[PDB]
PDB file of C-alpha atoms in Angstrom:
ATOM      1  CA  UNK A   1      -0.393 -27.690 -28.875  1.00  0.00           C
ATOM      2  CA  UNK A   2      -3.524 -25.986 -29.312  1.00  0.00           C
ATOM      3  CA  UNK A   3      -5.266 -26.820 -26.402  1.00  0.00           C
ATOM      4  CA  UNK A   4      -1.633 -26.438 -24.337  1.00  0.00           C
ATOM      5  CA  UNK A   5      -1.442 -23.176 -25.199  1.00  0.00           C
ATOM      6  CA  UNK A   6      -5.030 -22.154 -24.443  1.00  0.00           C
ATOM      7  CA  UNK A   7      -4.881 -23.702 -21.076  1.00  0.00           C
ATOM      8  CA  UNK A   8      -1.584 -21.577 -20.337  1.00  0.00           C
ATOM      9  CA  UNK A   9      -3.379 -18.217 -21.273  1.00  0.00           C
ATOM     10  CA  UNK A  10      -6.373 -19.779 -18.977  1.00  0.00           C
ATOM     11  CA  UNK A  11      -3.986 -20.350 -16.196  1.00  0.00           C
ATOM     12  CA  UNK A  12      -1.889 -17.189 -16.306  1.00  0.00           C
ATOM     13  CA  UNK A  13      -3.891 -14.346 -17.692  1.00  0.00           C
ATOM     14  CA  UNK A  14      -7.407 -15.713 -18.341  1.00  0.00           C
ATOM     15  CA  UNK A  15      -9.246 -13.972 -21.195  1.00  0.00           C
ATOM     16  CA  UNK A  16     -10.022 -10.524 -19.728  1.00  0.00           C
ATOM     17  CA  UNK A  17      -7.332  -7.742 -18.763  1.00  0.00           C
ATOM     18  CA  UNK A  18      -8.426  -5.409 -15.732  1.00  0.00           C
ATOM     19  CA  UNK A  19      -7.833  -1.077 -16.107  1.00  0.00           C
ATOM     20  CA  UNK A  20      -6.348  -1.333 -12.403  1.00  0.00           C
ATOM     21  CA  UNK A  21      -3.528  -3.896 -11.282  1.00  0.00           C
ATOM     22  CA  UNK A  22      -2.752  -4.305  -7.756  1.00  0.00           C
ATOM     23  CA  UNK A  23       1.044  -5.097  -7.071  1.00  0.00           C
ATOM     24  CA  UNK A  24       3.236  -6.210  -4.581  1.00  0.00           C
ATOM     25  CA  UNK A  25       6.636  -6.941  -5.048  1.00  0.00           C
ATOM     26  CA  UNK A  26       9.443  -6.731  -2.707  1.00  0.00           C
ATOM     27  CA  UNK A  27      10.909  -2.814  -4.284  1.00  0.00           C
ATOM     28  CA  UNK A  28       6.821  -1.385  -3.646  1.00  0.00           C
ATOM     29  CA  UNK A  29       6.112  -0.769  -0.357  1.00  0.00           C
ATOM     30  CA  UNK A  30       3.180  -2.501   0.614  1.00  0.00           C
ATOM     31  CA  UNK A  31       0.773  -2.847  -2.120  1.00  0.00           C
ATOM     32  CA  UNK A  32       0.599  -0.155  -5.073  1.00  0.00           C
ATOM     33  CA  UNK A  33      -1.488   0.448  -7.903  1.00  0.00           C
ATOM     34  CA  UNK A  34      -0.713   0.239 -11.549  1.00  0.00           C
ATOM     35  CA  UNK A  35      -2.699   1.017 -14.308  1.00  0.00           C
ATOM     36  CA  UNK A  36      -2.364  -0.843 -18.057  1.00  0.00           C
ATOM     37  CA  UNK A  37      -2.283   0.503 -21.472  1.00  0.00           C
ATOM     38  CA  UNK A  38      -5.580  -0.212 -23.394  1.00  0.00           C
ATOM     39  CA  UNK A  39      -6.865  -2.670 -21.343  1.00  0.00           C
ATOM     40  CA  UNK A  40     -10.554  -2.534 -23.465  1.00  0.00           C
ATOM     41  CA  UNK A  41      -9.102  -3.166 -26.759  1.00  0.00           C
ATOM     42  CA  UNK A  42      -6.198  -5.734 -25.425  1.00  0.00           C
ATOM     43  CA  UNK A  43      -9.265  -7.620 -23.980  1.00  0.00           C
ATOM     44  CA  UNK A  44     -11.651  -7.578 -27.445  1.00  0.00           C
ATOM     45  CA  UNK A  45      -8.325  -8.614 -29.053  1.00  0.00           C
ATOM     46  CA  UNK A  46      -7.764 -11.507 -26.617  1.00  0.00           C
ATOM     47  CA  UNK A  47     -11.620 -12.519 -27.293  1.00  0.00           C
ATOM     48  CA  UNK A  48     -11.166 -12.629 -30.918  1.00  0.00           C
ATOM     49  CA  UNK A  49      -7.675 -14.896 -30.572  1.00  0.00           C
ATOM     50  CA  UNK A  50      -9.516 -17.184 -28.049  1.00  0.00           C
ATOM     51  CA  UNK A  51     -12.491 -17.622 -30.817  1.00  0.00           C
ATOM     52  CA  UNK A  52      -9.992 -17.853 -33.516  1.00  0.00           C
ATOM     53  CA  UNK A  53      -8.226 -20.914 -31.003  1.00  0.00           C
ATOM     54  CA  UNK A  54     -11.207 -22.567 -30.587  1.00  0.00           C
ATOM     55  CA  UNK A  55     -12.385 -22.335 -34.061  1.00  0.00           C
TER      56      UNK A  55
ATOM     57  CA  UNK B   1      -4.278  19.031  34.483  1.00  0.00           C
ATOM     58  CA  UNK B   2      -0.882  17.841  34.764  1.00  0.00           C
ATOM     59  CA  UNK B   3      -1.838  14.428  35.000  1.00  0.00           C
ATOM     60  CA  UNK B   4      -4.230  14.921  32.369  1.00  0.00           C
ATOM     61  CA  UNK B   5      -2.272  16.328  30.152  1.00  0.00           C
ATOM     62  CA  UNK B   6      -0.193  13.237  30.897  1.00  0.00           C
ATOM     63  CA  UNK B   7      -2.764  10.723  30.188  1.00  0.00           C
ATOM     64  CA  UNK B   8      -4.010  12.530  26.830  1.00  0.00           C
ATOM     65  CA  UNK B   9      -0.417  12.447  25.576  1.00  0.00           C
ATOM     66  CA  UNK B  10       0.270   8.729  26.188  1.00  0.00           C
ATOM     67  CA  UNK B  11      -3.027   8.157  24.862  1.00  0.00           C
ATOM     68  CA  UNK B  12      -2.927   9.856  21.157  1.00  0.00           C
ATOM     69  CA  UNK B  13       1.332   9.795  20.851  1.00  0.00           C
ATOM     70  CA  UNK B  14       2.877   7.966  23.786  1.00  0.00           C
ATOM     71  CA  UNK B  15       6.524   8.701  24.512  1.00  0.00           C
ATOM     72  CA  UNK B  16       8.504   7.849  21.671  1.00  0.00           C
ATOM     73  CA  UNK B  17       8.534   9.097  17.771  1.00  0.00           C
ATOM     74  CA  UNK B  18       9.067   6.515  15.036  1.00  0.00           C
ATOM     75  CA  UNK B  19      11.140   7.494  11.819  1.00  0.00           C
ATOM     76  CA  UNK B  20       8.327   5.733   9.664  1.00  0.00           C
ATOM     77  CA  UNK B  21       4.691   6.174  10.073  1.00  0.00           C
ATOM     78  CA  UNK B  22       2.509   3.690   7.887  1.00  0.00           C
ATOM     79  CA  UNK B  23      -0.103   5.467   6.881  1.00  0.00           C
ATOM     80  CA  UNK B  24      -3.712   4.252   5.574  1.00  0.00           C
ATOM     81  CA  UNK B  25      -5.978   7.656   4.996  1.00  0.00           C
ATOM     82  CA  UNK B  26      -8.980   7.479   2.247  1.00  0.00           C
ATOM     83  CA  UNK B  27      -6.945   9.597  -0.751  1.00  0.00           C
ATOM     84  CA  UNK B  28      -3.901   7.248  -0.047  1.00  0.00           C
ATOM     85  CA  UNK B  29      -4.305   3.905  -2.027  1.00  0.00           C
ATOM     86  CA  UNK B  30      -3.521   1.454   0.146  1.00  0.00           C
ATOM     87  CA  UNK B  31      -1.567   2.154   2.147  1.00  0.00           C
ATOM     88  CA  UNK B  32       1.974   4.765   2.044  1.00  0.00           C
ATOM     89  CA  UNK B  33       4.675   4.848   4.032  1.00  0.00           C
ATOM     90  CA  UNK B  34       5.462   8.573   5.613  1.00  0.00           C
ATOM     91  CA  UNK B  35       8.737   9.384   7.236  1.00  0.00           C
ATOM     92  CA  UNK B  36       9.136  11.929   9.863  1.00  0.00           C
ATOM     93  CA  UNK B  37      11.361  15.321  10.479  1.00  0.00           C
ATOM     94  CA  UNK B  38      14.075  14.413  13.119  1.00  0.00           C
ATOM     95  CA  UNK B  39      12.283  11.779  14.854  1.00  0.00           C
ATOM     96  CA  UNK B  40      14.918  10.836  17.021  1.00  0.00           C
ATOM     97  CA  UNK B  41      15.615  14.694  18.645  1.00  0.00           C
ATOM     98  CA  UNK B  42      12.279  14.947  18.987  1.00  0.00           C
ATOM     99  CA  UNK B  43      11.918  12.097  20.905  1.00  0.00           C
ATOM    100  CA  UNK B  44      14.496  12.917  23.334  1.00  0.00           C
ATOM    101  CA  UNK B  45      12.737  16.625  23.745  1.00  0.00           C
ATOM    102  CA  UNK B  46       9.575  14.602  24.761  1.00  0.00           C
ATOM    103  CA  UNK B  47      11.191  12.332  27.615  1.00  0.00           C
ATOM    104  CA  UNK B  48      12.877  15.801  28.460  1.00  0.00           C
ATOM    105  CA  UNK B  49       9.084  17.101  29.101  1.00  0.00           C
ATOM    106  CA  UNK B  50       7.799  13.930  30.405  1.00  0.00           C
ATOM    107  CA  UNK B  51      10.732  14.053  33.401  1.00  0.00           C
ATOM    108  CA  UNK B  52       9.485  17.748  33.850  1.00  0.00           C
ATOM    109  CA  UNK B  53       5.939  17.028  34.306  1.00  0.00           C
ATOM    110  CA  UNK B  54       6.707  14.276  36.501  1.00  0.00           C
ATOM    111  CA  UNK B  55       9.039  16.219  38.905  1.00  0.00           C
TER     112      UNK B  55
END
């Protein structure tokens, strides 16, 4: 289950979060730009789960 | 200069006006979609002076 899980987050998110997102869904039109909420500390926080995982 | 006045019009506008004008300018992520005042009336006004200049 461990390693299940930690390959979902790998294929999904990865381990990193990005300030800028680039979006296109069918309501946008074209491509837009969003931008997250704390993407710094989401990403130290997703570090320390992923050592915690592995540990 | 009629017919150059002719040729410089078909060259930046041509004869028509579309209602949506996609729009890809450096301030502009991306790129936006613009929409245009009376597109259709003022497309008829320029086939109006197209016949003009012609005759």
């Amino acid at each position: 289950f461990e390693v299940a899980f930690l390959l979902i987050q790998w294929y999904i998110y990865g381990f990193s979060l990005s300030a800028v997102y680039t979006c296109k869904r069918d309501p946008c039109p074209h491509q837009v730009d969003c931008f997250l909420s704390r993407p710094t500390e989401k990403t130290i926080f997703i570090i320390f789960m992923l050592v915690v995982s592995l540990v």
